[PDB]
Design a protein around this ligand. Structure first.
Ligand SMILES: CC(=O)Nc1cc(Cn2ccnc2)c2cccc(O)c2n1
Length: 124
């Protein structure tokens, strides 16, 4: 059984648009999205489809790039740091659920390096 995916809107949460959040959508996310190793991370983990019945028994803060993209499109975030924390939750989830050297981990590691390169300099 999959849990509900993370919210992409919340009327109790204030919205904001900043130059950095625009960049995180237009440049950072949409470039990572095209990476050859992006596809496992483009949607919430479907534990039923992927036969990972222990995934949500281990991962209690799920995050994926599909959710992040929708949050950026919704102006769900207050600032760029909030969005960056979601990326880091996504990468760390993969490292927590899996082991060093796993194919999926090698994929997340390559994406994390590209992500770090892209956020090294943000607009002002
Ligand atoms: C042990 C295990 O299956 N771990 C897996 C497998 C898949 C599905 N997958 C595998 C290769 N490409 C996509 C994952 C997909 C997304 C995030 C994960 O943490 C995953 N972890």
């Amino acid at each position: 059984m999959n849990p509900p995916p993370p919210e992409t809107s919340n009327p109790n949460k204030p919205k904001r648009q900043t130059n950095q959040l625009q960049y995180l959508l237009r440049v950072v996310l949409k470039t990572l999205w095209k990476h050859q190793f992006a596809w496992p991370f483009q949607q919430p983990v479907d534990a039923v489809k992927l036969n990972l019945p222990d995934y949500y028994k281990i991962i209690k803060t799920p995050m994926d790039m599909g959710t992040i993209k929708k949050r950026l499109e919704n102006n769900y975030y207050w600032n760029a740091q909030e969005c960056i924390q979601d990326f880091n939750t996504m990468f760390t989830n993969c490292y927590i659920y899996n082991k060093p050297g796993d194919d999926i981990v090698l994929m997340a590691e390559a994406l994390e390096k590209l992500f770090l390169q892209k956020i090294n300099e943000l607009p002002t």
